[PDB]
mmCIF file of C-alpha atoms and ligand atoms in Angstrom:
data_model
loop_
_atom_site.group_PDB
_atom_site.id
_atom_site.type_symbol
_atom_site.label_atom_id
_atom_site.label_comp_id
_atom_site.label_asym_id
_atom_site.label_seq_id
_atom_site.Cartn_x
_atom_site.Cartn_y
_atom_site.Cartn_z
ATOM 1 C CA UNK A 2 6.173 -34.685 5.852
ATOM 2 C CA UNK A 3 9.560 -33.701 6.238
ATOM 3 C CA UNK A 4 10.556 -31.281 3.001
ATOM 4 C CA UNK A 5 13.547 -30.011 2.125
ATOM 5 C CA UNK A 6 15.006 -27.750 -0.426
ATOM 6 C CA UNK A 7 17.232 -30.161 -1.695
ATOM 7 C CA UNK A 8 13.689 -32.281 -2.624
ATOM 8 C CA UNK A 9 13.545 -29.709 -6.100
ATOM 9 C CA UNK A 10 15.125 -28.110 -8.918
ATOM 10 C CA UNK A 11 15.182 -24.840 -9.072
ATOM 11 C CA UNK A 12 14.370 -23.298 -12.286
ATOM 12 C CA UNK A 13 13.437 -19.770 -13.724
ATOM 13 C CA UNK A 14 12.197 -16.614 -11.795
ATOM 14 C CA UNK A 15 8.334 -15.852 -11.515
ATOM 15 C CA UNK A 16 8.738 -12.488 -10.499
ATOM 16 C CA UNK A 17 8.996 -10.261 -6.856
ATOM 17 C CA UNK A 18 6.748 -10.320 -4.188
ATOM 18 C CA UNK A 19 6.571 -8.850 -1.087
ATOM 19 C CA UNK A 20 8.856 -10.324 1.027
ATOM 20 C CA UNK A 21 10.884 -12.865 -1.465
ATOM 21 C CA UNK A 22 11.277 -14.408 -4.979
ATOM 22 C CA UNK A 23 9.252 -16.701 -6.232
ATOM 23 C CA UNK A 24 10.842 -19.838 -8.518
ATOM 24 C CA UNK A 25 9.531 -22.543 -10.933
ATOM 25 C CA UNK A 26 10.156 -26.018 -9.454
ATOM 26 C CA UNK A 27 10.026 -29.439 -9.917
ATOM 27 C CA UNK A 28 10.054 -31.876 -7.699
ATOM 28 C CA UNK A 29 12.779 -34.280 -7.898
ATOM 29 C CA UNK A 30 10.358 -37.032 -5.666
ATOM 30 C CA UNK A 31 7.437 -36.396 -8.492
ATOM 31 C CA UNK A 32 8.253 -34.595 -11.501
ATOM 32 C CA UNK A 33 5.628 -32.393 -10.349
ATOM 33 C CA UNK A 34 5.557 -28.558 -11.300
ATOM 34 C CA UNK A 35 4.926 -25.982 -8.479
ATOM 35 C CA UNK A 36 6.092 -23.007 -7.293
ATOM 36 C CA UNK A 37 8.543 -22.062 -4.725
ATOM 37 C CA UNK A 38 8.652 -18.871 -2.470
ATOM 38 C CA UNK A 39 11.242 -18.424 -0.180
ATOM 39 C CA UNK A 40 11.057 -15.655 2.730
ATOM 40 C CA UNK A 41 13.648 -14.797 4.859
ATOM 41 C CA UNK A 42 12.756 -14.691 8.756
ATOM 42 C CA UNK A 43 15.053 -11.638 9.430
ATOM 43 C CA UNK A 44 12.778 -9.282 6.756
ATOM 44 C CA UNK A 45 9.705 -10.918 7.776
ATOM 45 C CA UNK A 46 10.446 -10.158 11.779
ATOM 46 C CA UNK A 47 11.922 -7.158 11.209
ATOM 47 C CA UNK A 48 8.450 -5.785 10.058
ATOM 48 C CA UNK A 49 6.168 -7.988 12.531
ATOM 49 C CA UNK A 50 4.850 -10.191 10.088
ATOM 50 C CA UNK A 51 5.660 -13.333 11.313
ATOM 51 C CA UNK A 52 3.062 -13.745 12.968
ATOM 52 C CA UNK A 53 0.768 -14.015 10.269
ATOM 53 C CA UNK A 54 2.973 -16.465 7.931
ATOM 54 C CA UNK A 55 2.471 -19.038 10.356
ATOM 55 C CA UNK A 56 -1.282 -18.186 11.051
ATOM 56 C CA UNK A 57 -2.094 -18.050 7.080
ATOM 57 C CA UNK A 58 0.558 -20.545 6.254
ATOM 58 C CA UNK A 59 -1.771 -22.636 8.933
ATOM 59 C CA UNK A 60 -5.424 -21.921 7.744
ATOM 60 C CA UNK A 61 -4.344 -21.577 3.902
ATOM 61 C CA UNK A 62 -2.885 -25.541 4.433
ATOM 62 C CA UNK A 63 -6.778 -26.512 5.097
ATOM 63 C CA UNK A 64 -8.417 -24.858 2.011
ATOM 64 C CA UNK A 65 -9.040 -26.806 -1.186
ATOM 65 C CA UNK A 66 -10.804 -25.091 -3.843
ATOM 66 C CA UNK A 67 -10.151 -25.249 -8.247
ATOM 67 C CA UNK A 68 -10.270 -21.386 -7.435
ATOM 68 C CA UNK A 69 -7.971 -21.309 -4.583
ATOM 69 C CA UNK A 70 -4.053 -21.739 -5.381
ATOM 70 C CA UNK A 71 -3.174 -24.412 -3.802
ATOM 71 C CA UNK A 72 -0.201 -24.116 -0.924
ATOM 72 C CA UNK A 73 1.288 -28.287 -0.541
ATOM 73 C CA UNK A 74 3.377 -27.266 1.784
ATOM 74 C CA UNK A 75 5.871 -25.024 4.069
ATOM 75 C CA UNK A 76 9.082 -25.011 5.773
ATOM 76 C CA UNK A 77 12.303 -23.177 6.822
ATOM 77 C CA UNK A 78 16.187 -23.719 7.609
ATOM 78 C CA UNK A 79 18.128 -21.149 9.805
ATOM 79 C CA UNK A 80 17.656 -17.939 7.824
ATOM 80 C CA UNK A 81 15.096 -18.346 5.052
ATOM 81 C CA UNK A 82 11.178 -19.685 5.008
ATOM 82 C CA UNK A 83 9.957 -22.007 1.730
ATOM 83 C CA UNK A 84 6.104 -22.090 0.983
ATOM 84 C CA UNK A 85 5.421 -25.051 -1.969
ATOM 85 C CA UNK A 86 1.976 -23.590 -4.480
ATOM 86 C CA UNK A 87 0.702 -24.733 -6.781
ATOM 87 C CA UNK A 88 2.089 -23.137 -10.094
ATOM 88 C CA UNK A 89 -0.018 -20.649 -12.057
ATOM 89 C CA UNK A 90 1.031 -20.542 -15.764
ATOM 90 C CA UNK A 91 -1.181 -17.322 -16.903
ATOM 91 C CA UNK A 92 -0.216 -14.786 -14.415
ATOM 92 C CA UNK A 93 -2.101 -12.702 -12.707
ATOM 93 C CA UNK A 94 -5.269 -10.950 -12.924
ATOM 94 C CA UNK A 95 -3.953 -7.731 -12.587
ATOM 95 C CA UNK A 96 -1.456 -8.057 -15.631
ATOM 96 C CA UNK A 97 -4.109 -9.581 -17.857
ATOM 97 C CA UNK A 98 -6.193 -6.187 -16.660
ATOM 98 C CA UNK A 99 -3.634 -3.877 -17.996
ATOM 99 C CA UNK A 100 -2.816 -5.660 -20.975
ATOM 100 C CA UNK A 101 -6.299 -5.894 -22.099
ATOM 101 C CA UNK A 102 -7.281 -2.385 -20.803
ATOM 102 C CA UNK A 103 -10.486 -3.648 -18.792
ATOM 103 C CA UNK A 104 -12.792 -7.040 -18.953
ATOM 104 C CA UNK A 105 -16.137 -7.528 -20.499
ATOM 105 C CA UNK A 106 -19.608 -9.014 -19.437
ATOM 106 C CA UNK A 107 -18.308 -12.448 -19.509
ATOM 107 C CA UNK A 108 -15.555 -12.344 -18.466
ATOM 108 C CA UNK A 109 -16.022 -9.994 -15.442
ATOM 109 C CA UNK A 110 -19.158 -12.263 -14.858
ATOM 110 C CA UNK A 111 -17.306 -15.987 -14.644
ATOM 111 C CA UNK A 112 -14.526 -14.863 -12.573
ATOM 112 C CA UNK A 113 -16.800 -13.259 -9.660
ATOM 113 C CA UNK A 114 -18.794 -16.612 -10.035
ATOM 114 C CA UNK A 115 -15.008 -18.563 -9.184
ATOM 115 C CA UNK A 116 -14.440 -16.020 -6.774
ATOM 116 C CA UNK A 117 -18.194 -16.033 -5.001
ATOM 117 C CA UNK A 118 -17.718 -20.015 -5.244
ATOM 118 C CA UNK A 119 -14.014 -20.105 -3.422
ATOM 119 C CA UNK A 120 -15.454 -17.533 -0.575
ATOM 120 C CA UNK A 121 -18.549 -19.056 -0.088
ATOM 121 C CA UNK A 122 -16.042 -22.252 0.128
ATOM 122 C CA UNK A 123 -14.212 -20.032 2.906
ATOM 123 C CA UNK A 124 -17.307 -19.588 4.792
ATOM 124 C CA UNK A 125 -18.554 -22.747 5.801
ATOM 125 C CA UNK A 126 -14.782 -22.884 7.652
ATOM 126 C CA UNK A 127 -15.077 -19.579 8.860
ATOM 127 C CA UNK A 128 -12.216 -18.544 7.155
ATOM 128 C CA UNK A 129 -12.386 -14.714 5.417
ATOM 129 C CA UNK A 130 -9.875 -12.688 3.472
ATOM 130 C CA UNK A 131 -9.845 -8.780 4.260
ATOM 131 C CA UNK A 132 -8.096 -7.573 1.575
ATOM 132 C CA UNK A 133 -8.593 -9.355 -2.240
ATOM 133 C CA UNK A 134 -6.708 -7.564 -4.928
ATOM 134 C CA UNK A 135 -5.810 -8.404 -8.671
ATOM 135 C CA UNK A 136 -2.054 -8.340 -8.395
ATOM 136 C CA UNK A 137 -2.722 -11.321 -5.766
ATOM 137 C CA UNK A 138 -5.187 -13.034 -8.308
ATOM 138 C CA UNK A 139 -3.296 -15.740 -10.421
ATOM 139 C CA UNK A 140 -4.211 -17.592 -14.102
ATOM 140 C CA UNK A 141 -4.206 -21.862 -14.488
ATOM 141 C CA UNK A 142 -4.119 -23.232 -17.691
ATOM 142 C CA UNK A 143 -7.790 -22.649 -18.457
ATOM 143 C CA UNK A 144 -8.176 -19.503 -17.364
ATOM 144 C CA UNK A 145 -9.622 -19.677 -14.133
ATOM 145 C CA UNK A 146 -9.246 -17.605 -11.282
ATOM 146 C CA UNK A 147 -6.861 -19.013 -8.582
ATOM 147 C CA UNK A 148 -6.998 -16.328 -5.388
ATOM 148 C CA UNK A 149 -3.656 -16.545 -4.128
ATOM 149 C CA UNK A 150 -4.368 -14.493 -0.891
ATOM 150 C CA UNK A 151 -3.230 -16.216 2.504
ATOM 151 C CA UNK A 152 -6.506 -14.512 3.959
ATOM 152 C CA UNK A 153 -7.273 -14.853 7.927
ATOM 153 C CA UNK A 168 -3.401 -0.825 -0.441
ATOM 154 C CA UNK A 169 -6.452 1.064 0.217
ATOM 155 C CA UNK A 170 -8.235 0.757 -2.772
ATOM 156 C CA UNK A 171 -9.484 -2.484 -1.941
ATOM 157 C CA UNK A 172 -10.004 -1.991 2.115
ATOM 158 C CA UNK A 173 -13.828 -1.664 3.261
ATOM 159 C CA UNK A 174 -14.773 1.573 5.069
ATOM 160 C CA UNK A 175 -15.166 -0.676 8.245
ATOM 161 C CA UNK A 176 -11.794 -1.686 7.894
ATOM 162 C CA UNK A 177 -9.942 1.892 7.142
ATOM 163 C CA UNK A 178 -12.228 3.973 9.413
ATOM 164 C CA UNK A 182 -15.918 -6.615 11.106
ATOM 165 C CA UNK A 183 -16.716 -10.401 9.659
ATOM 166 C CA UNK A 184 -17.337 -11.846 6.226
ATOM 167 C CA UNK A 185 -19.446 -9.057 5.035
ATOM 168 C CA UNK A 186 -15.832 -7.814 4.052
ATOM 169 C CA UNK A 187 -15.077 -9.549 0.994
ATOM 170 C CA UNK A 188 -18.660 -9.351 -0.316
ATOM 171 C CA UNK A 189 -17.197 -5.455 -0.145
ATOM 172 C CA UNK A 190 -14.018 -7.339 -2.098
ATOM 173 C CA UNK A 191 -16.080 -8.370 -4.912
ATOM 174 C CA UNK A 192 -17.552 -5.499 -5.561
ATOM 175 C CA UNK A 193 -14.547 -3.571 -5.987
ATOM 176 C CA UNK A 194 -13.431 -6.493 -8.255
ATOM 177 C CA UNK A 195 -16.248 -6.378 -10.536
ATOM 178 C CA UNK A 196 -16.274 -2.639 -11.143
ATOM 179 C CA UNK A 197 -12.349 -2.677 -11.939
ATOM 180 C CA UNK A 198 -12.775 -6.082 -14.477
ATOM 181 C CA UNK A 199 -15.254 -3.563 -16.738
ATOM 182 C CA UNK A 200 -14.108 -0.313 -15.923
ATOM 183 C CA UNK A 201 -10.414 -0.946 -15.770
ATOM 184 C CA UNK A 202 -9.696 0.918 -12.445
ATOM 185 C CA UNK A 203 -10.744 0.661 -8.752
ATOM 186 C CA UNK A 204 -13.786 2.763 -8.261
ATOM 187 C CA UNK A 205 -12.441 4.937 -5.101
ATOM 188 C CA UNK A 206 -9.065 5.831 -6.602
ATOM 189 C CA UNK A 207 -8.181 9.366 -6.107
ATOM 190 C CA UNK A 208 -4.879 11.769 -6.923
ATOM 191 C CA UNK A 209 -4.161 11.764 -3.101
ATOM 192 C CA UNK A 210 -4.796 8.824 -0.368
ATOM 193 C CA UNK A 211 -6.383 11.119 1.414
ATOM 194 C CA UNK A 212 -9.535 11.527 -1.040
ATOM 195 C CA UNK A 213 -9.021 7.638 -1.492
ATOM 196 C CA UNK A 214 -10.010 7.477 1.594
ATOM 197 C CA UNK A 215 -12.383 10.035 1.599
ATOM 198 C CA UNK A 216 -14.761 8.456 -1.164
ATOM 199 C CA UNK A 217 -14.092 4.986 0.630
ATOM 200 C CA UNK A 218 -15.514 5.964 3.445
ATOM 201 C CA UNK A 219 -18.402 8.144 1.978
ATOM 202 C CA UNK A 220 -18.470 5.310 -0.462
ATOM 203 C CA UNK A 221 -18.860 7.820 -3.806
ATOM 204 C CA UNK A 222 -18.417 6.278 -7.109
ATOM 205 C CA UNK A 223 -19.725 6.606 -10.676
ATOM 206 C CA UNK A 224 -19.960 4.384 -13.333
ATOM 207 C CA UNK A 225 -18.979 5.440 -17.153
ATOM 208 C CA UNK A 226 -21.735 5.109 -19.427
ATOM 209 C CA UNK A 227 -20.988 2.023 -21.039
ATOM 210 C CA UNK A 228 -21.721 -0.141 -17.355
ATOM 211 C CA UNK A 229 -24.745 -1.596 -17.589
ATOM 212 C CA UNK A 230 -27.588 -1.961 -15.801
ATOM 213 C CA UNK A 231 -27.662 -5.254 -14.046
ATOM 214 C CA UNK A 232 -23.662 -4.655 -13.595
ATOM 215 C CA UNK A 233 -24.523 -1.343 -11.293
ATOM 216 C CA UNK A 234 -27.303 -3.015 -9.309
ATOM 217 C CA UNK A 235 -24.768 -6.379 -8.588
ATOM 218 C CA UNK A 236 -21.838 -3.554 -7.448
ATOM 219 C CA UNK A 237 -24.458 -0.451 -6.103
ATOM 220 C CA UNK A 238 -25.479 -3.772 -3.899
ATOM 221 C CA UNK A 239 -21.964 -4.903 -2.942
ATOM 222 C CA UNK A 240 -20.504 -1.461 -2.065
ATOM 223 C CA UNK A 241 -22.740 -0.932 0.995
ATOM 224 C CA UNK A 242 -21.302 1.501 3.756
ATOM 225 C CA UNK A 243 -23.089 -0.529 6.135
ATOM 226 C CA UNK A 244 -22.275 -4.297 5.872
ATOM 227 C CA UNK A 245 -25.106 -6.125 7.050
ATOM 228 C CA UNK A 246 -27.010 -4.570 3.953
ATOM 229 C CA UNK A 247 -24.169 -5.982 1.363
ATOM 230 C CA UNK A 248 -26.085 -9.295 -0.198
ATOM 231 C CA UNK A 249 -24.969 -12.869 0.569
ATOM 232 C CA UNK A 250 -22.211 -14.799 -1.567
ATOM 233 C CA UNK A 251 -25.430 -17.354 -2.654
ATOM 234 C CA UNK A 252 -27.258 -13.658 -3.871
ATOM 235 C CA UNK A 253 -24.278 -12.815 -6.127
ATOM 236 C CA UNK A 254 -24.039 -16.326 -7.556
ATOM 237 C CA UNK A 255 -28.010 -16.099 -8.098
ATOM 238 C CA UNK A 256 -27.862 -12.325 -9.117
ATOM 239 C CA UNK A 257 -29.358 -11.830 -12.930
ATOM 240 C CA UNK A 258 -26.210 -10.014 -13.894
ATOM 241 C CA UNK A 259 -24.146 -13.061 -13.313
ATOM 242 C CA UNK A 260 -26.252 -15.582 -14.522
ATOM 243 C CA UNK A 261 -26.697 -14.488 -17.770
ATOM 244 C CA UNK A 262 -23.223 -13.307 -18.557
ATOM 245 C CA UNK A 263 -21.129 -16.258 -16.646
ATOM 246 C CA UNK A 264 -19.222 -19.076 -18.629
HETATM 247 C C1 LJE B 301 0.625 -14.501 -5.078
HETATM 248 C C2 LJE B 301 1.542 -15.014 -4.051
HETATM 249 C C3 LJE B 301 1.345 -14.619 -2.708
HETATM 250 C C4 LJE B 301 2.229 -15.185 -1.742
HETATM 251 N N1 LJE B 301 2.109 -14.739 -0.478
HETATM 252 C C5 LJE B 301 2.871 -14.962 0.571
HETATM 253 O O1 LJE B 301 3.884 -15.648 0.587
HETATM 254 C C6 LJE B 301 2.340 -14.349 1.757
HETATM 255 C C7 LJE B 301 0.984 -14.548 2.129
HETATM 256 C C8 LJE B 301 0.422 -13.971 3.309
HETATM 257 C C9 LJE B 301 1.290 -13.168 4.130
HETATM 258 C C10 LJE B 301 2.708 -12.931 3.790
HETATM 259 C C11 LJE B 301 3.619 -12.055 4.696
HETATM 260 F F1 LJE B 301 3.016 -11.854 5.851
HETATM 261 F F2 LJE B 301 4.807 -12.634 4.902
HETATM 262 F F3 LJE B 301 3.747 -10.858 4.097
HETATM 263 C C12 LJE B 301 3.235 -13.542 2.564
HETATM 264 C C13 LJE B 301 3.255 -16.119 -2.089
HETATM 265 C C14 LJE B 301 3.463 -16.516 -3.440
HETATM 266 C C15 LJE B 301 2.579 -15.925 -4.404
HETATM 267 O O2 LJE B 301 2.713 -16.159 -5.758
HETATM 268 C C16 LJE B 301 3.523 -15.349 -6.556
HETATM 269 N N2 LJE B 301 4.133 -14.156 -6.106
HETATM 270 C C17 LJE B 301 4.928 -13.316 -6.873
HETATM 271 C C18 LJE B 301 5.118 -13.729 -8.243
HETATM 272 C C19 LJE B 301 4.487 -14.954 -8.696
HETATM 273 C C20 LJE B 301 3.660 -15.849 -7.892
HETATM 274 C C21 LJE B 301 3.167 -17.199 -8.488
HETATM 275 C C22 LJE B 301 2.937 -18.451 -7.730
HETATM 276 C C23 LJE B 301 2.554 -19.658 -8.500
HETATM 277 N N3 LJE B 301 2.397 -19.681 -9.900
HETATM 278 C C24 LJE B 301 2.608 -18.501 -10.608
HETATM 279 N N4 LJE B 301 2.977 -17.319 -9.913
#
């Protein structure tokens, strides 16, 4: 497959993100909406980063999940690199978050069920994430969660990883879940350095209104230890989710 940029048009703006902008496109071959990102090699070496482009770029070409956006394609020209996604229309996770202050029961519950069903996806490939936040978390038309993190902040890094295998992201959802009801990751401190303090020393509380079989599903995900955090097919089974899960 030979792309090109002159294979789309080029339409609005869907915001900043590290490394590049991010356009609306339509291919002029399909008719086909997507969305374009275009990097540019001199930012992306400058930083050592490179490397990992081409190694995500790689692994994220293989995945194909409903909760996984999508990534068609990649290329470059002298100066710039062009990843082809899928397009998200509801924005991300992290926006909705704010806007609506925090999530409830059902919510929360459905979209660690399309998150615990693209990582258990992952798994059987061996493929894990280290590092799932809600800024990188991304809407489709009906609402489902799209993670839009080329796996392979410290509010969302394990204690084994700021102080390991797939245990990591069962670490990930936990975080997840507590911030969807709660509105707020559950180490976050004034300072980084208390951040990663109660990281590490794993110390949280929940406010009142967290229920039950919400703090057993997280008090079980954030484990200090990893081989103690439950299994993806656990969380999918867990009571919590079950009975709260669209
Ligand atoms: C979320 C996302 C991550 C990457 N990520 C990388 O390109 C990337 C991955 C891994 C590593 C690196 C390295 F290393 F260069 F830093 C970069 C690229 C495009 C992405 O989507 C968007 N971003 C900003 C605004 C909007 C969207 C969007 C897309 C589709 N529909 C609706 N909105």
């Amino acid at each position: 497959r030979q792309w090109a940029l002159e294979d789309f048009e080029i339409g609005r703006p869907l915001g900043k993100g590290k490394f590049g902008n991010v356009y609306l496109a339509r291919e002029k071959q399909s008719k086909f909406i997507l969305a374009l990102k275009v990097l540019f090699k001199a930012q992306l070496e400058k930083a050592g980063v490179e490397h990992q482009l081409r190694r995500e770029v790689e692994i994220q070409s293989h995945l194909r999940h409903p909760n996984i956006l999508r990534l068609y394609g990649y290329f470059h020209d002298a100066t710039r690199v062009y990843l082809i996604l899928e397009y998200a229309p509801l924005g991300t996770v992290y926006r909705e978050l704010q806007k609506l202050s925090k999530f409830d029961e059902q919510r929360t519950a459905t979209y660690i069920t399309e998150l615990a069903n693209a990582l258990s996806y992952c798994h059987s490939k061996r493929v894990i994430h280290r590092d799932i936040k809600p800024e990188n978390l991304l809407l489709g038309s009906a609402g489902e969660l799209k993670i839009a993190d080329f796996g392979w902040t410290l509010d969302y890094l394990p204690p084994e990883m700021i102080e390991h295998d797939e245990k990591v992201d069962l670490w990930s959802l936990g975080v997840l879940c507590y911030e969807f009801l709660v509105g707020k990751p559950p180490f976050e401190a004034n300072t980084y350095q208390e951040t990663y303090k109660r990281i590490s020393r794993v110390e949280f509380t929940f406010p009142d209104f967290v229920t039950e079989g919400a703090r057993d599903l997280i008090s079980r995900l954030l484990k200090h230890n990893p081989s103690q955090r439950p299994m993806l097919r656990e969380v999918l089974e867990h009571p919590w989710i079950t009975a709260n899960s669209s």
